Design a protein around this nucleic acid. Structure first.
Length: 57
DNA sequence: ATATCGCACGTCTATTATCCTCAGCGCAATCAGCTGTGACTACCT
């Protein structure tokens, strides 16, 4: 299902607020569904940072 | 004839509300990967 969000003005200045906020539980559930497991997500972020280091070098 | 009031001529000081440089989120610059065209260079059995 689509994930809803709340457009809440930032507690800081009125410079550019109106930030979107999502429920943490829904985001975690969606991430687990997409990636299968938390270990897969950890491996994905590790290989992403490794690729970032490879690209910068 | 000499001090004295009206008028003027300025000048010092102020009972009082302005212009600079740090913040998420979405559209655009960037990049790795892959492939296509052409000739080249070479290497094994």
């Amino acid at each position: 299902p689509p994930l809803k969000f709340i457009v809440k003005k930032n507690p800081h200045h009125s410079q550019w607020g109106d930030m979107k906020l999502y429920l943490k539980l829904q985001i975690v559930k969606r991430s687990l569904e997409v990636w299968g497991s938390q270990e897969a997500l950890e491996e994905a972020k590790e290989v992403r940072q490794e690729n970032r280091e490879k690209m910068k070098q």
